[PDB]
Coordinates of all heavy atoms in Angstrom, one line a residue:
Chain S
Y1 N 0.8 -1.2 0.0 CA 0.0 0.0 0.0 C 0.9 1.3 0.0 O 2.1 1.2 0.2 CB -0.9 0.0 1.2 CG -1.8 -1.3 1.4 CD1 -1.9 -1.9 2.6 CD2 -2.4 -1.8 0.3 CE1 -2.7 -3.0 2.7 CE2 -3.2 -2.9 0.4 CZ -3.3 -3.5 1.6 OH -4.1 -4.7 1.8
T2 N 0.2 2.4 -0.3 CA 0.9 3.7 -0.3 C 0.1 4.8 0.4 O -1.1 4.9 0.1 CB 1.3 4.1 -1.7 OG1 1.5 2.9 -2.6 CG2 2.6 4.9 -1.7
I3 N 0.8 5.6 1.2 CA 0.1 6.7 1.9 C 0.9 7.9 2.0 O 2.1 7.9 2.3 CB -0.4 6.3 3.3 CG1 -1.6 5.4 3.2 CG2 -0.7 7.5 4.1 CD1 -2.0 4.7 4.5
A4 N 0.3 9.1 1.7 CA 1.0 10.4 1.8 C 0.1 11.4 2.4 O -0.9 11.7 1.8 CB 1.5 10.8 0.4
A5 N 0.5 12.0 3.5 CA -0.3 13.0 4.2 C 0.6 14.1 4.8 O 1.6 13.8 5.4 CB -1.2 12.4 5.3
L6 N 0.2 15.3 4.7 CA 0.9 16.5 5.2 C 0.0 17.4 6.0 O -1.1 17.7 5.6 CB 1.7 17.2 4.1 CG 0.9 18.4 3.5 CD1 1.3 19.7 4.2 CD2 1.1 18.5 2.0
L7 N 0.5 17.8 7.2 CA -0.3 18.7 8.0 C 0.7 19.8 8.7 O 1.6 19.4 9.4 CB -1.0 18.0 9.1 CG -0.6 16.5 9.3 CD1 -0.7 16.1 10.7 CD2 -1.5 15.6 8.4
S8 N 0.4 21.1 8.4 CA 1.2 22.1 8.9 C 0.4 23.2 9.7 O 0.2 24.3 9.2 CB 2.0 22.8 7.8 OG 2.9 21.9 7.2
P9 N -0.2 22.8 10.8 CA -1.0 23.7 11.6 C -0.2 24.9 12.1 O 1.0 24.8 12.5 CB -1.5 22.9 12.8 CG -0.5 21.7 12.9 CD -0.1 21.5 11.5
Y10 N -0.8 26.1 12.1 CA -0.1 27.3 12.5 C -0.9 28.0 13.6 O -2.2 27.9 13.7 CB 0.1 28.2 11.4 CG 1.4 28.0 10.6 CD1 1.8 26.7 10.3 CD2 2.2 29.1 10.3 CE1 3.0 26.5 9.6 CE2 3.4 28.9 9.7 CZ 3.8 27.6 9.3 OH 5.0 27.4 8.7
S11 N -0.2 28.8 14.5 CA -0.9 29.5 15.6 C -0.2 30.8 15.8 O 0.6 30.9 16.8 CB -0.9 28.7 16.8 OG -2.2 28.6 17.3
Chain P
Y1 N 2.7 34.0 6.7 CA 3.4 32.7 6.9 C 3.6 32.1 5.5 O 3.0 32.5 4.5 CB 2.6 31.8 7.8 CG 2.3 32.4 9.1 CD1 1.0 32.2 9.7 CD2 3.3 33.0 9.9 CE1 0.7 32.8 10.9 CE2 3.0 33.6 11.1 CZ 1.7 33.4 11.6 OH 1.4 33.9 12.9
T2 N 4.5 31.1 5.4 CA 4.8 30.4 4.2 C 4.9 28.9 4.4 O 5.5 28.4 5.4 CB 6.1 30.9 3.5 OG1 6.3 32.3 3.9 CG2 6.0 30.8 2.0
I3 N 4.3 28.1 3.5 CA 4.4 26.7 3.6 C 4.5 26.0 2.2 O 3.9 26.4 1.3 CB 3.1 26.1 4.3 CG1 3.2 26.3 5.8 CG2 2.9 24.6 3.9 CD1 1.9 25.9 6.5
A4 N 5.4 25.0 2.1 CA 5.7 24.3 0.9 C 5.8 22.8 1.2 O 6.8 22.4 1.9 CB 6.9 24.9 0.2
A5 N 5.0 22.0 0.6 CA 5.0 20.5 0.8 C 4.6 19.8 -0.4 O 3.7 20.1 -1.1 CB 4.2 20.1 2.0
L6 N 5.4 18.7 -0.7 CA 5.1 17.9 -1.9 C 5.1 16.4 -1.6 O 5.9 15.9 -0.8 CB 6.1 18.2 -3.0 CG 7.4 17.3 -3.0 CD1 7.2 16.1 -4.0 CD2 8.6 18.1 -3.4
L7 N 4.1 15.7 -2.1 CA 4.0 14.3 -1.9 C 3.6 13.5 -3.1 O 2.5 13.8 -3.7 CB 3.0 14.0 -0.7 CG 2.1 15.2 -0.3 CD1 0.7 14.8 -0.1 CD2 2.7 15.8 1.0
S8 N 4.4 12.6 -3.6 CA 4.1 11.8 -4.8 C 4.1 10.3 -4.5 O 5.0 9.6 -5.0 CB 5.1 12.2 -5.9 OG 5.0 13.6 -6.2
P9 N 3.1 9.8 -3.8 CA 3.0 8.4 -3.5 C 2.8 7.6 -4.8 O 2.1 8.0 -5.7 CB 1.8 8.3 -2.6 CG 1.0 9.5 -2.8 CD 2.0 10.6 -3.2
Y10 N 3.5 6.4 -4.8 CA 3.4 5.6 -6.0 C 3.0 4.2 -5.6 O 3.3 3.7 -4.5 CB 4.8 5.5 -6.8 CG 4.9 6.6 -7.8 CD1 4.6 7.9 -7.6 CD2 5.3 6.3 -9.1 CE1 4.7 8.9 -8.5 CE2 5.4 7.2 -10.1 CZ 5.1 8.5 -9.8 OH 5.2 9.5 -10.8
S11 N 2.4 3.5 -6.6 CA 1.9 2.1 -6.4 C 2.0 1.3 -7.7 O 0.9 1.3 -8.4 CB 0.5 2.1 -5.8 OG 0.4 1.4 -4.6
Chain X
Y1 N 0.8 -36.2 -17.3 CA -0.1 -35.0 -17.3 C 0.7 -33.7 -17.2 O 1.9 -33.7 -17.0 CB -1.0 -35.0 -16.0 CG -1.9 -36.3 -16.0 CD1 -2.0 -37.0 -14.7 CD2 -2.5 -36.8 -17.1 CE1 -2.7 -38.1 -14.6 CE2 -3.3 -38.0 -17.0 CZ -3.4 -38.6 -15.8 OH -4.1 -39.8 -15.7
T2 N 0.0 -32.6 -17.5 CA 0.7 -31.3 -17.5 C -0.1 -30.2 -16.8 O -1.3 -30.1 -17.1 CB 1.1 -30.8 -18.9 OG1 1.2 -32.0 -19.8 CG2 2.4 -30.0 -18.9
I3 N 0.5 -29.4 -16.0 CA -0.2 -28.3 -15.3 C 0.6 -27.1 -15.2 O 1.8 -27.1 -14.9 CB -0.7 -28.8 -13.9 CG1 -1.9 -29.7 -14.0 CG2 -1.0 -27.6 -13.0 CD1 -2.2 -30.3 -12.6
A4 N 0.0 -25.9 -15.4 CA 0.6 -24.6 -15.3 C -0.3 -23.6 -14.7 O -1.3 -23.3 -15.3 CB 1.1 -24.2 -16.7
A5 N 0.1 -23.0 -13.6 CA -0.7 -22.0 -12.9 C 0.2 -20.9 -12.3 O 1.2 -21.2 -11.7 CB -1.6 -22.7 -11.8
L6 N -0.3 -19.7 -12.4 CA 0.5 -18.6 -11.8 C -0.4 -17.7 -11.0 O -1.6 -17.3 -11.5 CB 1.2 -17.8 -12.9 CG 0.4 -16.6 -13.5 CD1 0.8 -15.3 -12.8 CD2 0.7 -16.5 -15.0
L7 N 0.0 -17.2 -9.9 CA -0.7 -16.3 -9.0 C 0.2 -15.3 -8.4 O 1.1 -15.6 -7.7 CB -1.5 -17.1 -7.9 CG -1.0 -18.6 -7.8 CD1 -1.1 -19.0 -6.3 CD2 -1.9 -19.5 -8.6
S8 N -0.1 -14.0 -8.6 CA 0.7 -12.9 -8.1 C -0.2 -11.9 -7.3 O -0.3 -10.8 -7.8 CB 1.5 -12.2 -9.2 OG 2.4 -13.2 -9.8
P9 N -0.7 -12.3 -6.1 CA -1.5 -11.4 -5.3 C -0.8 -10.2 -4.9 O 0.4 -10.3 -4.5 CB -2.0 -12.3 -4.2 CG -1.0 -13.4 -4.1 CD -0.5 -13.6 -5.5
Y10 N -1.4 -9.1 -4.8 CA -0.7 -7.8 -4.4 C -1.5 -7.1 -3.3 O -2.8 -7.2 -3.2 CB -0.5 -6.9 -5.6 CG 0.8 -7.1 -6.3 CD1 1.2 -8.4 -6.7 CD2 1.6 -6.0 -6.7 CE1 2.4 -8.5 -7.4 CE2 2.8 -6.2 -7.4 CZ 3.2 -7.4 -7.7 OH 4.4 -7.6 -8.4
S11 N -0.8 -6.4 -2.5 CA -1.4 -5.6 -1.4 C -0.7 -4.3 -1.1 O 0.1 -4.3 -0.2 CB -1.5 -6.5 -0.1 OG -2.8 -6.7 0.4
Chain Z
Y1 N 2.1 -1.1 -10.2 CA 2.8 -2.4 -10.1 C 3.1 -3.0 -11.5 O 2.5 -2.6 -12.5 CB 2.0 -3.3 -9.2 CG 1.7 -2.8 -7.8 CD1 0.4 -2.9 -7.3 CD2 2.6 -2.1 -7.1 CE1 0.1 -2.4 -6.1 CE2 2.3 -1.6 -5.8 CZ 1.0 -1.8 -5.3 OH 0.7 -1.3 -4.1
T2 N 3.9 -4.0 -11.5 CA 4.3 -4.7 -12.8 C 4.4 -6.2 -12.6 O 5.0 -6.6 -11.6 CB 5.6 -4.2 -13.4 OG1 5.8 -2.8 -13.0 CG2 5.5 -4.2 -14.9
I3 N 3.8 -7.0 -13.5 CA 3.9 -8.4 -13.4 C 4.1 -9.0 -14.8 O 3.4 -8.7 -15.7 CB 2.6 -9.0 -12.7 CG1 2.7 -8.8 -11.2 CG2 2.4 -10.5 -13.1 CD1 1.4 -9.2 -10.5
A4 N 4.9 -10.0 -14.8 CA 5.2 -10.8 -16.1 C 5.4 -12.2 -15.8 O 6.3 -12.6 -15.1 CB 6.4 -10.2 -16.8
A5 N 4.5 -13.1 -16.4 CA 4.6 -14.5 -16.2 C 4.2 -15.3 -17.5 O 3.2 -14.9 -18.2 CB 3.7 -14.9 -15.0
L6 N 4.9 -16.3 -17.8 CA 4.7 -17.1 -19.0 C 4.7 -18.6 -18.6 O 5.5 -19.1 -17.9 CB 5.7 -16.8 -20.1 CG 7.0 -17.7 -20.1 CD1 6.8 -18.9 -21.0 CD2 8.2 -16.9 -20.4
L7 N 3.7 -19.3 -19.2 CA 3.5 -20.7 -19.0 C 3.1 -21.5 -20.2 O 2.1 -21.1 -20.8 CB 2.5 -21.0 -17.9 CG 1.7 -19.8 -17.4 CD1 0.2 -20.2 -17.2 CD2 2.3 -19.2 -16.2
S8 N 4.0 -22.4 -20.7 CA 3.7 -23.1 -21.9 C 3.7 -24.6 -21.7 O 4.6 -25.3 -22.1 CB 4.7 -22.8 -23.0 OG 4.6 -21.4 -23.3
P9 N 2.7 -25.2 -20.9 CA 2.6 -26.6 -20.7 C 2.5 -27.4 -21.9 O 1.8 -27.0 -22.9 CB 1.4 -26.8 -19.8 CG 0.6 -25.5 -20.0 CD 1.6 -24.4 -20.3
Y10 N 3.1 -28.6 -22.0 CA 3.1 -29.4 -23.2 C 2.6 -30.8 -22.8 O 2.9 -31.3 -21.7 CB 4.4 -29.4 -23.9 CG 4.6 -28.4 -25.0 CD1 4.3 -27.0 -24.7 CD2 5.0 -28.7 -26.3 CE1 4.4 -26.1 -25.7 CE2 5.1 -27.7 -27.2 CZ 4.8 -26.4 -26.9 OH 5.0 -25.4 -27.9
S11 N 2.0 -31.5 -23.8 CA 1.5 -32.9 -23.5 C 1.6 -33.7 -24.8 O 0.5 -33.8 -25.5 CB 0.1 -32.9 -23.0 OG 0.0 -33.6 -21.8
Chain U
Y1 N -5.7 22.6 23.3 CA -6.5 22.0 22.2 C -6.8 20.5 22.6 O -6.2 20.0 23.5 CB -5.7 22.0 20.9 CG -5.3 23.4 20.5 CD1 -4.1 23.7 20.0 CD2 -6.2 24.5 20.6 CE1 -3.7 25.0 19.6 CE2 -5.9 25.8 20.2 CZ -4.6 26.0 19.7 OH -4.3 27.3 19.3
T2 N -7.7 19.9 21.8 CA -8.1 18.5 22.1 C -8.2 17.7 20.8 O -8.8 18.3 19.8 CB -9.4 18.4 22.9 OG1 -9.5 19.6 23.7 CG2 -9.3 17.2 23.8
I3 N -7.7 16.5 20.7 CA -7.8 15.7 19.5 C -8.0 14.2 19.9 O -7.4 13.7 20.7 CB -6.6 15.9 18.6 CG1 -6.6 17.2 17.9 CG2 -6.5 14.7 17.6 CD1 -5.3 17.5 17.1
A4 N -8.9 13.6 19.1 CA -9.2 12.2 19.3 C -9.4 11.5 18.0 O -10.4 11.8 17.3 CB -10.4 12.0 20.2
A5 N -8.6 10.5 17.7 CA -8.7 9.8 16.4 C -8.4 8.3 16.6 O -7.5 7.9 17.3 CB -7.8 10.4 15.3
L6 N -9.2 7.4 16.0 CA -9.0 6.0 16.0 C -9.0 5.4 14.7 O -9.9 5.7 13.8 CB -10.1 5.4 16.9 CG -11.3 4.8 16.2 CD1 -11.2 3.4 15.9 CD2 -12.5 5.1 17.1
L7 N -8.1 4.5 14.4 CA -8.0 3.8 13.1 C -7.6 2.3 13.4 O -6.6 2.0 14.0 CB -6.9 4.4 12.2 CG -6.0 5.5 12.9 CD1 -4.6 5.4 12.3 CD2 -6.6 6.9 12.8
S8 N -8.5 1.4 12.9 CA -8.3 0.0 13.1 C -8.3 -0.8 11.7 O -9.3 -1.5 11.5 CB -9.3 -0.6 14.1 OG -9.1 0.0 15.3
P9 N -7.4 -0.6 10.9 CA -7.3 -1.2 9.5 C -7.2 -2.7 9.7 O -6.5 -3.2 10.6 CB -6.1 -0.6 8.9 CG -5.2 -0.1 10.0 CD -6.2 0.3 11.0
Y10 N -7.9 -3.5 8.8 CA -7.9 -4.9 8.9 C -7.5 -5.5 7.5 O -7.8 -4.9 6.5 CB -9.2 -5.5 9.4 CG -9.4 -5.6 10.9 CD1 -9.0 -4.6 11.7 CD2 -9.9 -6.8 11.4 CE1 -9.1 -4.7 13.1 CE2 -10.0 -6.9 12.8 CZ -9.6 -5.9 13.6 OH -9.7 -6.0 15.0
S11 N -6.9 -6.7 7.6 CA -6.5 -7.4 6.4 C -6.7 -8.9 6.5 O -5.6 -9.6 6.8 CB -5.1 -7.1 6.0 OG -5.0 -6.5 4.7
Chain W
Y1 N -14.9 -10.2 12.2 CA -14.0 -9.4 13.1 C -14.8 -8.6 14.1 O -16.0 -8.4 13.9 CB -13.1 -8.5 12.3 CG -12.3 -9.3 11.2 CD1 -12.2 -8.8 9.9 CD2 -11.6 -10.4 11.5 CE1 -11.5 -9.4 8.9 CE2 -10.9 -11.1 10.5 CZ -10.8 -10.6 9.2 OH -10.1 -11.3 8.3
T2 N -14.1 -8.1 15.1 CA -14.7 -7.2 16.1 C -13.9 -6.1 16.5 O -12.7 -6.2 16.7 CB -15.1 -8.0 17.4 OG1 -15.3 -9.4 17.1 CG2 -16.3 -7.5 18.1
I3 N -14.5 -4.9 16.7 CA -13.7 -3.7 17.0 C -14.6 -2.8 18.0 O -15.8 -2.6 17.8 CB -13.3 -2.9 15.8 CG1 -12.1 -3.5 15.1 CG2 -13.0 -1.4 16.2 CD1 -11.8 -2.8 13.8
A4 N -13.9 -2.3 19.0 CA -14.6 -1.4 20.0 C -13.6 -0.3 20.4 O -12.6 -0.5 21.0 CB -15.0 -2.2 21.2
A5 N -14.0 1.0 20.1 CA -13.2 2.1 20.5 C -14.0 3.3 20.9 O -15.1 3.6 20.3 CB -12.3 2.5 19.3
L6 N -13.6 4.0 22.0 CA -14.3 5.1 22.5 C -13.4 6.3 22.7 O -12.3 6.2 23.2 CB -15.1 4.8 23.8 CG -14.3 5.0 25.1 CD1 -14.6 6.4 25.7 CD2 -14.6 3.9 26.1
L7 N -13.9 7.5 22.3 CA -13.1 8.7 22.4 C -14.0 9.9 22.9 O -14.9 10.2 22.2 CB -12.4 9.1 21.1 CG -12.8 8.2 19.9 CD1 -12.9 9.1 18.7 CD2 -11.8 7.1 19.7
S8 N -13.7 10.5 24.0 CA -14.4 11.6 24.5 C -13.6 12.8 24.8 O -13.4 13.2 26.0 CB -15.2 11.2 25.8 OG -16.1 10.1 25.5
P9 N -13.0 13.5 23.8 CA -12.2 14.6 23.9 C -13.0 15.8 24.6 O -14.1 16.0 24.3 CB -11.8 15.0 22.5 CG -12.8 14.4 21.6 CD -13.2 13.1 22.3
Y10 N -12.3 16.5 25.5 CA -12.9 17.6 26.2 C -12.1 18.9 26.0 O -10.9 18.9 25.9 CB -13.1 17.3 27.7 CG -14.4 16.6 28.0 CD1 -14.9 15.5 27.3 CD2 -15.2 17.1 29.0 CE1 -16.1 14.9 27.6 CE2 -16.5 16.5 29.3 CZ -16.9 15.4 28.6 OH -18.1 14.8 28.9
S11 N -12.8 20.1 26.0 CA -12.2 21.4 25.9 C -12.9 22.4 26.7 O -13.7 23.2 26.2 CB -12.2 21.8 24.4 OG -10.8 22.1 24.0
Chain E
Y1 N -16.0 -45.6 -4.0 CA -15.1 -44.9 -3.1 C -15.9 -44.0 -2.1 O -17.1 -43.8 -2.3 CB -14.1 -44.0 -3.9 CG -13.3 -44.8 -4.9 CD1 -13.2 -44.3 -6.2 CD2 -12.7 -46.0 -4.6 CE1 -12.5 -45.0 -7.2 CE2 -12.0 -46.7 -5.6 CZ -11.9 -46.2 -6.9 OH -11.1 -46.9 -7.8
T2 N -15.2 -43.5 -1.1 CA -15.8 -42.6 -0.1 C -14.9 -41.4 0.3 O -13.7 -41.6 0.5 CB -16.2 -43.4 1.2 OG1 -16.4 -44.8 0.9 CG2 -17.5 -42.9 1.8
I3 N -15.5 -40.3 0.4 CA -14.8 -39.1 0.8 C -15.6 -38.2 1.7 O -16.8 -37.9 1.5 CB -14.4 -38.3 -0.5 CG1 -13.2 -38.9 -1.1 CG2 -14.1 -36.8 -0.1 CD1 -12.8 -38.3 -2.4
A4 N -15.0 -37.7 2.7 CA -15.6 -36.8 3.7 C -14.7 -35.6 4.1 O -13.6 -35.9 4.7 CB -16.1 -37.5 4.9
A5 N -15.0 -34.4 3.8 CA -14.2 -33.3 4.2 C -15.1 -32.1 4.6 O -16.1 -31.8 4.0 CB -13.3 -32.9 3.0
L6 N -14.6 -31.4 5.6 CA -15.4 -30.2 6.1 C -14.4 -29.0 6.4 O -13.3 -29.2 6.9 CB -16.1 -30.6 7.4 CG -15.3 -30.3 8.7 CD1 -15.7 -28.9 9.3 CD2 -15.6 -31.4 9.8
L7 N -14.8 -27.8 5.9 CA -14.0 -26.6 6.1 C -14.9 -25.5 6.5 O -15.9 -25.1 5.8 CB -13.3 -26.3 4.8 CG -13.7 -27.1 3.6 CD1 -13.8 -26.3 2.3 CD2 -12.8 -28.3 3.3
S8 N -14.6 -24.8 7.6 CA -15.4 -23.7 8.1 C -14.5 -22.5 8.4 O -14.3 -22.1 9.6 CB -16.2 -24.1 9.4 OG -17.1 -25.2 9.1
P9 N -14.0 -21.9 7.4 CA -13.1 -20.7 7.5 C -13.9 -19.5 8.1 O -15.0 -19.3 7.8 CB -12.7 -20.4 6.1 CG -13.7 -21.0 5.2 CD -14.1 -22.2 5.9
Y10 N -13.2 -18.8 9.1 CA -13.9 -17.7 9.7 C -13.0 -16.4 9.6 O -11.8 -16.5 9.4 CB -14.1 -18.0 11.2 CG -15.4 -18.7 11.5 CD1 -15.8 -19.8 10.8 CD2 -16.2 -18.2 12.6 CE1 -17.1 -20.3 11.1 CE2 -17.4 -18.7 12.9 CZ -17.8 -19.8 12.1 OH -19.0 -20.4 12.4
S11 N -13.7 -15.3 9.6 CA -13.1 -14.0 9.5 C -13.8 -12.9 10.3 O -14.7 -12.3 9.8 CB -13.1 -13.6 8.0 OG -11.7 -13.3 7.6
Chain V
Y1 N -6.6 -12.6 6.6 CA -7.4 -13.3 5.5 C -7.7 -14.7 5.9 O -7.1 -15.2 6.9 CB -6.6 -13.3 4.2 CG -6.2 -11.9 3.7 CD1 -5.0 -11.6 3.2 CD2 -7.1 -10.8 3.8 CE1 -4.6 -10.4 2.8 CE2 -6.8 -9.5 3.4 CZ -5.5 -9.3 2.9 OH -5.1 -8.1 2.4
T2 N -8.6 -15.4 5.2 CA -9.0 -16.7 5.5 C -9.2 -17.5 4.2 O -9.8 -17.0 3.3 CB -10.3 -16.8 6.4 OG1 -10.4 -15.7 7.2 CG2 -10.2 -18.1 7.3
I3 N -8.7 -18.8 4.2 CA -8.8 -19.6 3.0 C -9.0 -21.1 3.4 O -8.3 -21.6 4.3 CB -7.5 -19.5 2.1 CG1 -7.6 -18.2 1.3 CG2 -7.5 -20.6 1.1 CD1 -6.3 -17.9 0.5
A4 N -9.9 -21.7 2.7 CA -10.2 -23.1 2.9 C -10.4 -23.9 1.6 O -11.3 -23.5 0.9 CB -11.4 -23.3 3.8
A5 N -9.6 -24.8 1.3 CA -9.7 -25.6 0.0 C -9.4 -27.1 0.2 O -8.4 -27.4 0.9 CB -8.8 -25.0 -1.1
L6 N -10.2 -27.9 -0.4 CA -10.0 -29.4 -0.3 C -10.0 -30.0 -1.6 O -10.9 -29.7 -2.5 CB -11.1 -30.0 0.7 CG -12.3 -30.5 0.0 CD1 -12.2 -32.0 -0.3 CD2 -13.5 -30.3 0.8
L7 N -9.1 -30.9 -1.9 CA -9.0 -31.7 -3.1 C -8.7 -33.1 -2.9 O -7.6 -33.4 -2.3 CB -8.0 -31.0 -4.1 CG -7.1 -30.0 -3.4 CD1 -5.7 -30.0 -4.0 CD2 -7.7 -28.6 -3.6
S8 N -9.5 -34.0 -3.3 CA -9.3 -35.5 -3.1 C -9.4 -36.2 -4.5 O -10.3 -37.0 -4.7 CB -10.3 -36.0 -2.1 OG -10.2 -35.4 -0.9
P9 N -8.4 -36.0 -5.4 CA -8.4 -36.7 -6.7 C -8.3 -38.2 -6.5 O -7.6 -38.7 -5.6 CB -7.2 -36.1 -7.4 CG -6.4 -35.6 -6.3 CD -7.3 -35.1 -5.2
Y10 N -9.0 -39.0 -7.4 CA -9.0 -40.4 -7.3 C -8.6 -41.0 -8.6 O -8.9 -40.4 -9.7 CB -10.3 -40.9 -6.8 CG -10.4 -41.1 -5.3 CD1 -10.0 -40.1 -4.4 CD2 -10.9 -42.3 -4.7 CE1 -10.1 -40.2 -3.1 CE2 -11.0 -42.4 -3.4 CZ -10.6 -41.4 -2.5 OH -10.7 -41.5 -1.2
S11 N -8.0 -42.2 -8.6 CA -7.7 -42.9 -9.8 C -7.8 -44.4 -9.7 O -6.8 -45.1 -9.5 CB -6.2 -42.5 -10.2 OG -6.2 -42.0 -11.6

């Protein structure tokens, strides 16, 4: 399988 | 702010 | 007799 | 994905 | 902050 | 199969 | 001839 | 996964 996820939360 | 992200999942 | 079978399961 | 299989049964 | 996530993949 | 999960996030 | 077989796969 | 197979060839 293949998975790609990106998360760049800012405050 | 600045954000740069790249994702190239392959299968 | 003769037999030929191929199986390439992927996940 | 990639798959290559050959079968030539003879009788 | 508060976060709640559940993942139960099966095969 | 069987699965049981509980999540009660508070803020 | 006589044959007896049982299979109960579970998931 | 689950698999169940039976084969009783006779001659």
